[PDB]
Protein backbone atom coordinates (compact mmCIF):
# COMPACT_ATOMS: atom_id res chain seq x y z
CA UNK A 1 0.00 0.00 0.00
CA UNK A 2 1.31 3.42 -1.16
CA UNK A 3 0.81 6.44 1.77
CA UNK A 4 -0.30 9.31 0.76
CA UNK A 5 -1.10 8.03 -3.16
CA UNK A 6 -3.62 10.36 -4.81
CA UNK A 7 -5.67 8.48 -7.06
CA UNK A 8 -8.70 6.21 -5.82
CA UNK A 9 -9.50 3.54 -7.95
CA UNK A 10 -12.04 0.59 -7.19
CA UNK A 11 -11.66 -2.41 -8.84
CA UNK A 12 -14.56 -4.62 -9.31
CA UNK A 13 -13.42 -8.31 -9.44
CA UNK A 14 -16.14 -10.82 -10.11
CA UNK A 15 -14.98 -14.02 -8.55
CA UNK A 16 -17.12 -17.43 -8.02
CA UNK A 17 -19.79 -15.32 -9.80
CA UNK A 18 -20.01 -12.51 -7.59
CA UNK A 19 -18.10 -9.27 -7.44
CA UNK A 20 -16.46 -7.91 -4.56
CA UNK A 21 -15.18 -4.80 -4.97
CA UNK A 22 -11.28 -3.40 -3.51
CA UNK A 23 -11.16 -0.12 -3.06
CA UNK A 24 -7.72 0.69 -3.62
CA UNK A 25 -4.85 3.36 -4.16
CA UNK A 26 -2.54 4.51 -6.89
CA UNK A 27 0.37 6.93 -6.97
CA UNK A 28 0.90 6.82 -10.77
CA UNK A 29 -1.95 6.14 -14.22
CA UNK A 30 1.08 5.78 -16.99
CA UNK A 31 2.70 2.86 -15.66
CA UNK A 32 3.31 0.00 -13.03
CA UNK A 33 0.01 -2.04 -12.53
CA UNK A 34 -2.88 -1.10 -10.30
CA UNK A 35 -3.43 -4.20 -8.46
CA UNK A 36 -5.36 -5.07 -5.48
CA UNK A 37 -2.72 -7.55 -3.39
CA UNK A 38 -1.99 -6.97 -0.35
CA UNK A 39 -3.86 -3.48 -1.10
CA UNK A 40 -6.74 -1.85 -0.79
CA UNK A 41 -9.91 -2.34 1.56
CA UNK A 42 -12.75 -5.15 0.43
CA UNK A 43 -16.04 -4.49 0.04
CA UNK A 44 -18.90 -6.52 -0.62
CA UNK A 45 -22.36 -6.93 -2.45
CA UNK A 46 -23.12 -4.12 -5.37
CA UNK A 47 -21.64 -0.36 -4.75
CA UNK A 48 -21.13 2.36 -6.76
CA UNK A 49 -18.99 5.28 -6.01
CA UNK A 50 -19.65 9.40 -6.12
CA UNK A 51 -17.16 11.34 -4.60
CA UNK A 52 -17.78 14.79 -3.18
CA UNK A 53 -15.55 16.77 -1.25
CA UNK A 54 -12.86 14.62 -0.03
CA UNK A 55 -15.16 12.11 0.71
CA UNK A 56 -16.28 9.17 -1.82
CA UNK A 57 -19.85 7.59 -1.02
CA UNK A 58 -19.75 3.65 -1.94
CA UNK A 59 -23.79 3.52 -1.97
CA UNK A 60 -25.16 -0.07 -1.96
CA UNK A 61 -27.46 -1.98 -4.32
CA UNK A 62 -29.59 -4.46 -4.78
CA UNK A 63 -30.93 -5.18 -2.00
CA UNK A 64 -27.76 -3.00 -0.03
CA UNK A 65 -29.35 0.24 1.94
CA UNK A 66 -26.30 1.96 3.42
CA UNK A 67 -23.78 4.28 1.91
CA UNK A 68 -20.30 4.30 3.34
CA UNK A 69 -17.82 7.05 3.50
CA UNK A 70 -14.47 6.63 2.54
CA UNK A 71 -11.90 9.14 3.35
CA UNK A 72 -7.94 9.85 3.35
CA UNK A 73 -6.41 8.97 6.84
CA UNK A 74 -4.51 10.85 8.52
CA UNK A 75 -1.58 8.60 7.77
CA UNK A 76 -2.07 9.01 3.92
CA UNK A 77 -4.37 5.82 3.47
CA UNK A 78 -7.93 5.37 3.10
CA UNK A 79 -10.22 4.50 5.41
CA UNK A 80 -14.18 3.63 5.79
CA UNK A 81 -15.29 6.92 7.96
CA UNK A 82 -19.17 7.20 8.59
CA UNK A 83 -22.39 5.79 7.20
CA UNK A 84 -25.89 6.23 6.77
CA UNK A 85 -28.89 4.11 5.91
CA UNK A 86 -31.92 4.13 4.08
CA UNK A 87 -34.68 1.58 2.96
CA UNK A 88 -34.58 1.13 -0.62
CA UNK A 89 -32.14 2.22 -3.07
CA UNK A 90 -30.56 6.10 -3.59
CA UNK A 91 -32.05 6.50 -7.15
CA UNK A 92 -30.32 9.94 -7.49
CA UNK A 93 -27.44 11.26 -6.00
CA UNK A 94 -25.46 14.71 -6.46
CA UNK A 95 -24.22 17.52 -4.10
CA UNK A 96 -25.95 20.69 -3.71
CA UNK A 97 -23.24 23.16 -1.89
CA UNK A 98 -19.98 22.06 -0.54
CA UNK A 99 -20.88 20.51 2.62
CA UNK A 100 -24.80 18.62 1.65
CA UNK A 101 -25.54 16.32 -0.44
CA UNK A 102 -29.02 15.43 -2.32
CA UNK A 103 -30.33 12.44 -2.93
CA UNK A 104 -33.95 10.98 -4.36
CA UNK A 105 -35.15 7.78 -3.21
CA UNK A 106 -38.42 6.12 -5.55
CA UNK A 107 -40.14 2.76 -4.54
CA UNK A 108 -39.49 0.14 -6.56
CA UNK A 109 -43.06 0.31 -8.20
CA UNK A 110 -46.60 1.31 -7.24
CA UNK A 111 -47.66 -1.00 -4.71
CA UNK A 112 -44.22 -0.68 -3.44
CA UNK A 113 -45.79 2.63 -1.97
CA UNK A 114 -46.34 6.76 -3.20
CA UNK A 115 -43.86 8.35 -1.44
CA UNK A 116 -40.49 9.18 -2.46
CA UNK A 117 -37.84 10.76 -0.16
CA UNK A 118 -35.08 13.43 -0.15
CA UNK A 119 -32.32 13.27 2.01
CA UNK A 120 -30.26 15.70 2.72
CA UNK A 121 -26.28 14.43 4.24
CA UNK A 122 -24.17 15.85 5.33
CA UNK A 123 -20.40 15.69 3.71
CA UNK A 124 -18.60 15.72 6.43
CA UNK A 125 -20.26 13.45 8.78
CA UNK A 126 -21.71 11.17 6.14
CA UNK A 127 -25.27 11.49 7.94
CA UNK A 128 -28.58 12.06 7.21
CA UNK A 129 -29.54 16.11 8.46
CA UNK A 130 -32.35 16.36 6.72
CA UNK A 131 -35.34 14.22 5.23
CA UNK A 132 -38.64 15.06 3.52
CA UNK A 133 -40.81 12.83 1.53
CA UNK A 134 -43.20 13.90 -1.60
CA UNK A 135 -45.78 12.70 -3.92
CA UNK A 136 -45.09 10.40 -7.19
CA UNK A 137 -47.57 11.48 -8.69
CA UNK A 138 -46.64 13.78 -12.06
CA UNK A 139 -43.92 11.15 -12.31
CA UNK A 140 -45.85 8.03 -12.72
CA UNK A 141 -48.42 10.15 -14.70
CA UNK A 142 -47.49 7.99 -17.89
CA UNK A 143 -45.35 5.29 -16.30
CA UNK A 144 -43.73 3.99 -13.56
CA UNK A 145 -40.37 6.22 -13.56
CA UNK A 146 -37.01 5.39 -13.72
CA UNK A 147 -34.67 8.32 -12.51
CA UNK A 148 -31.30 9.08 -15.00
CA UNK A 149 -29.97 12.15 -12.71
CA UNK A 150 -30.72 14.79 -10.75
CA UNK A 151 -29.29 18.39 -9.92
CA UNK A 152 -29.35 21.43 -7.80
CA UNK A 153 -29.59 24.74 -9.21
CA UNK A 154 -30.93 28.31 -7.57
CA UNK A 155 -32.93 26.51 -5.29
CA UNK A 156 -34.49 24.24 -7.32
CA UNK A 157 -34.14 20.38 -7.23
CA UNK A 158 -34.12 18.70 -11.15
CA UNK A 159 -34.62 15.44 -12.07
CA UNK A 160 -35.11 13.75 -15.48
CA UNK A 161 -36.42 10.39 -15.55
CA UNK A 162 -37.95 8.06 -18.10
CA UNK A 163 -41.79 6.13 -17.48
CA UNK A 164 -40.66 2.95 -17.74
CA UNK A 165 -43.03 -0.34 -17.72
CA UNK A 166 -41.23 -1.93 -13.82
CA UNK A 167 -42.26 -5.47 -14.69
CA UNK A 168 -41.77 -5.76 -18.54
CA UNK A 169 -39.37 -2.80 -18.88
CA UNK A 170 -41.21 -1.06 -21.59
CA UNK A 171 -40.39 2.64 -22.19
CA UNK A 172 -43.30 2.94 -24.48
CA UNK A 173 -43.44 6.92 -24.54
CA UNK A 174 -39.48 8.10 -26.06
CA UNK A 175 -40.53 10.68 -27.93
CA UNK A 176 -40.82 13.33 -24.93
CA UNK A 177 -37.84 14.94 -22.91
CA UNK A 178 -39.67 14.45 -19.55
CA UNK A 179 -37.78 16.91 -16.27
CA UNK A 180 -39.66 17.72 -13.10
CA UNK A 181 -38.67 20.93 -11.16
CA UNK A 182 -39.27 20.79 -7.00
CA UNK A 183 -39.05 23.09 -4.46
CA UNK A 184 -35.90 22.57 -2.43
CA UNK A 185 -36.53 22.49 1.35
CA UNK A 186 -40.35 21.37 0.54
CA UNK A 187 -39.49 18.90 -2.16
CA UNK A 188 -42.94 20.57 -3.25
CA UNK A 189 -43.82 19.44 -6.78
CA UNK A 190 -43.79 22.76 -9.51
CA UNK A 191 -43.62 22.13 -13.23
CA UNK A 192 -42.82 19.20 -15.42
CA UNK A 193 -41.01 20.44 -18.10
CA UNK A 194 -41.26 18.43 -21.04
CA UNK A 195 -40.17 18.91 -24.77
CA UNK A 196 -40.92 17.40 -28.30
CA UNK A 197 -37.40 18.42 -29.85
CA UNK A 198 -35.97 14.96 -28.45
CA UNK A 199 -37.09 12.02 -26.26
CA UNK A 200 -36.56 11.34 -22.66
CA UNK A 201 -33.43 12.73 -21.40
CA UNK A 202 -30.58 9.61 -19.97
CA UNK A 203 -30.95 6.39 -19.97
CA UNK A 204 -31.32 3.72 -17.35
CA UNK A 205 -29.29 3.53 -13.81
CA UNK A 206 -26.75 5.48 -15.87
CA UNK A 207 -27.07 8.77 -14.18
CA UNK A 208 -26.57 10.69 -17.27
CA UNK A 209 -29.65 12.59 -17.73
CA UNK A 210 -28.34 16.42 -16.89
CA UNK A 211 -25.27 17.99 -15.83
CA UNK A 212 -24.38 21.14 -14.75
CA UNK A 213 -21.37 23.86 -16.03
CA UNK A 214 -19.45 26.72 -15.08
CA UNK A 215 -21.87 29.04 -15.87
CA UNK A 216 -24.70 27.58 -13.76
CA UNK A 217 -26.80 26.59 -16.71
CA UNK A 218 -27.74 22.92 -16.73
CA UNK A 219 -27.50 20.37 -19.91
CA UNK A 220 -29.47 17.11 -20.47
CA UNK A 221 -28.48 14.38 -22.78
CA UNK A 222 -31.38 12.30 -25.10
CA UNK A 223 -30.50 9.18 -26.40
CA UNK A 224 -33.57 6.68 -26.56
CA UNK A 225 -30.58 4.01 -26.63
CA UNK A 226 -31.90 0.71 -27.03
CA UNK A 227 -28.43 -0.63 -26.12
CA UNK A 228 -28.69 1.15 -22.61
CA UNK A 229 -31.55 -0.53 -22.09
CA UNK A 230 -34.80 0.90 -24.06
CA UNK A 231 -37.25 -0.81 -25.64
CA UNK A 232 -37.62 1.57 -28.58
CA UNK A 233 -36.54 5.03 -30.58
CA UNK A 234 -38.39 7.75 -32.05
CA UNK A 235 -36.42 10.92 -31.78
CA UNK A 236 -32.79 11.58 -32.21
CA UNK A 237 -30.05 11.89 -29.99
CA UNK A 238 -28.96 15.30 -28.75
CA UNK A 239 -28.63 17.65 -26.12
CA UNK A 240 -30.69 19.85 -24.72
CA UNK A 241 -30.27 23.41 -22.35
CA UNK A 242 -32.08 24.73 -19.18
CA UNK A 243 -30.85 28.14 -17.54
CA UNK A 244 -29.71 28.81 -14.86
CA UNK A 245 -32.40 28.83 -12.11
CA UNK A 246 -35.03 28.32 -14.83
CA UNK A 247 -38.20 26.37 -15.24
CA UNK A 248 -38.04 26.12 -19.09
CA UNK A 249 -35.91 25.24 -22.24
CA UNK A 250 -33.85 27.11 -24.21
CA UNK A 251 -33.86 27.74 -28.13
CA UNK A 252 -30.57 25.36 -27.35
CA UNK A 253 -30.46 22.56 -29.79
CA UNK A 254 -27.80 20.18 -30.39
CA UNK A 255 -28.86 17.28 -32.70
CA UNK A 256 -26.25 14.28 -31.89
CA UNK A 257 -27.38 11.80 -33.56
CA UNK A 258 -27.34 13.37 -36.86
CA UNK A 259 -24.11 15.27 -36.78
CA UNK A 260 -22.22 12.30 -34.88
CA UNK A 261 -23.76 9.49 -38.21
CA UNK A 262 -26.27 7.57 -36.62
CA UNK A 263 -24.66 7.21 -33.31
CA UNK A 264 -26.02 7.54 -29.68
CA UNK A 265 -23.91 8.55 -26.71
CA UNK A 266 -24.22 5.67 -24.01
CA UNK A 267 -21.78 8.10 -21.64
CA UNK A 268 -20.85 11.16 -20.76
CA UNK A 269 -18.58 13.20 -18.13
CA UNK A 270 -18.66 16.84 -18.39
CA UNK A 271 -15.02 17.94 -18.62
CA UNK A 272 -15.08 21.89 -18.41
CA UNK A 273 -15.58 24.36 -20.98
CA UNK A 274 -18.52 22.95 -23.25
CA UNK A 275 -15.76 19.81 -23.52
CA UNK A 276 -17.45 16.30 -22.51
CA UNK A 277 -15.75 12.82 -22.43
CA UNK A 278 -17.91 10.68 -24.26
CA UNK A 279 -18.35 7.00 -24.65
CA UNK A 280 -20.68 6.31 -27.98
CA UNK A 281 -22.49 3.34 -29.23
CA UNK A 282 -20.90 1.76 -32.73
CA UNK A 283 -23.95 -0.15 -33.60
CA UNK A 284 -25.93 2.39 -36.41
CA UNK A 285 -29.01 0.29 -36.01
CA UNK A 286 -29.48 -0.19 -32.39
CA UNK A 287 -31.70 -3.64 -32.59
CA UNK A 288 -33.47 -5.24 -29.29
CA UNK A 289 -30.80 -8.05 -29.71
CA UNK A 290 -28.20 -5.03 -28.37
CA UNK A 291 -30.50 -4.25 -25.31
CA UNK A 292 -28.45 -3.64 -22.06
CA UNK A 293 -25.70 -4.67 -24.08
CA UNK A 294 -23.75 -1.17 -24.27
CA UNK A 295 -20.87 -2.92 -26.40
CA UNK A 296 -18.75 -1.40 -28.66
CA UNK A 297 -18.10 1.78 -27.58
CA UNK A 298 -16.02 4.81 -28.52
CA UNK A 299 -14.72 8.13 -26.76
CA UNK A 300 -14.54 11.13 -28.53
CA UNK A 301 -14.85 14.65 -27.34
CA UNK A 302 -17.96 16.64 -27.64
CA UNK A 303 -18.16 20.26 -28.10
CA UNK A 304 -21.50 21.51 -26.98
CA UNK A 305 -20.62 25.52 -27.54
CA UNK A 306 -19.15 24.48 -31.68
CA UNK A 307 -21.53 21.35 -31.67
CA UNK A 308 -18.97 18.85 -32.67
CA UNK A 309 -18.16 15.71 -31.63
CA UNK A 310 -14.09 14.35 -32.45
CA UNK A 311 -12.99 10.54 -32.07
CA UNK A 312 -10.43 9.41 -29.71
CA UNK A 313 -8.84 6.90 -32.46
CA UNK A 314 -5.81 5.71 -29.92
CA UNK A 315 -8.29 4.25 -27.74
CA UNK A 316 -10.28 0.78 -29.24
CA UNK A 317 -13.58 0.32 -29.55
CA UNK A 318 -14.36 -1.39 -26.40
CA UNK A 319 -17.72 -2.83 -23.96
CA UNK A 320 -19.25 -0.39 -21.53
CA UNK A 321 -19.73 -0.74 -18.09
CA UNK A 322 -23.75 -0.68 -18.62
CA UNK A 323 -26.00 1.25 -16.68
CA UNK A 324 -23.93 2.31 -14.16
CA UNK A 325 -21.94 5.46 -13.17
CA UNK A 326 -19.54 6.37 -15.74
CA UNK A 327 -15.76 5.95 -13.95
CA UNK A 328 -13.73 8.87 -15.64
CA UNK A 329 -11.56 10.94 -13.58
CA UNK A 330 -10.77 14.77 -15.18
CA UNK A 331 -7.55 15.53 -13.55
CA UNK A 332 -4.83 18.09 -14.73
CA UNK A 333 -6.48 18.94 -17.92
CA UNK A 334 -7.03 15.35 -18.77
CA UNK A 335 -9.52 12.82 -18.87
CA UNK A 336 -8.28 9.27 -17.55
CA UNK A 337 -10.48 6.27 -18.80
CA UNK A 338 -10.25 2.63 -17.89
CA UNK A 339 -10.87 0.79 -21.19
CA UNK A 340 -11.10 -2.76 -20.74
CA UNK A 341 -9.35 -4.15 -24.79
CA UNK A 342 -8.41 -7.54 -25.68
CA UNK A 343 -5.35 -7.64 -24.41
CA UNK A 344 -6.59 -6.50 -21.17
CA UNK A 345 -7.66 -3.15 -19.26
CA UNK A 346 -5.93 -0.04 -19.63
CA UNK A 347 -5.88 3.16 -18.07
CA UNK A 348 -6.17 6.23 -21.28
CA UNK A 349 -5.16 9.26 -20.77
CA UNK A 350 -7.12 11.72 -23.28
CA UNK A 351 -6.07 14.88 -24.46
CA UNK A 352 -9.61 16.94 -25.09
CA UNK A 353 -7.78 19.56 -27.29
CA UNK A 354 -6.23 17.09 -29.48
CA UNK A 355 -9.00 14.64 -28.87
CA UNK A 356 -6.21 12.37 -28.51
CA UNK A 357 -5.04 9.19 -25.77
CA UNK A 358 -2.42 7.55 -24.44
CA UNK A 359 -2.29 4.67 -23.16
CA UNK A 360 -1.06 4.32 -19.26
CA UNK A 361 -1.04 2.21 -16.58
CA UNK A 362 -2.41 -1.99 -16.82
CA UNK A 363 -5.24 -2.54 -13.86
CA UNK A 364 -5.69 -6.14 -13.13
CA UNK A 365 -9.45 -6.39 -12.04
CA UNK A 366 -12.97 -6.96 -14.33
CA UNK A 367 -13.69 -3.25 -14.18
CA UNK A 368 -13.54 -0.09 -12.02
CA UNK A 369 -16.47 0.82 -9.93
CA UNK A 370 -15.09 4.85 -9.18
CA UNK A 371 -11.89 6.21 -10.09
CA UNK A 372 -11.52 9.70 -7.89
CA UNK A 373 -8.83 11.86 -6.67
CA UNK A 374 -7.86 12.95 -3.44
CA UNK A 375 -5.81 15.70 -1.67
FE1 LIG B 1 -30.25 -5.42 -12.54
Same mark, same amino acid.
Given at each position: ?????????????????????????????????????? %?????????????????????????????????????????????????????????? &?????????????????????????????????????????????????????????????????????????????? &????????????????????????????????????????????????????????????????????????????????????????????????? /??????????????????????????????????? %?????? %???????????????????? /????????????????????????????? %????????????? &?
Amino acid at each position: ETPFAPYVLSLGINSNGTTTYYVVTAPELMSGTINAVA %KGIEQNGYRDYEQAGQTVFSIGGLGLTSATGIVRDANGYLTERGDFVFNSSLNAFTQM &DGQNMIGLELPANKESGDQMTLYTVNISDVSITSQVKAPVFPLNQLEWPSITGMCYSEGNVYVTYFPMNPSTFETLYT &DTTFVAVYSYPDMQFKTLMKDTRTGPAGSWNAFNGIFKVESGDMYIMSNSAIANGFSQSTKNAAFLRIPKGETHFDDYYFDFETVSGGLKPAHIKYI /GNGLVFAEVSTISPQTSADRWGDKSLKCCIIDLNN %KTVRDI %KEIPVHNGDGGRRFAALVDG /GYVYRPVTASEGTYIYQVDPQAATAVRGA %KVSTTFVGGFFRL &D
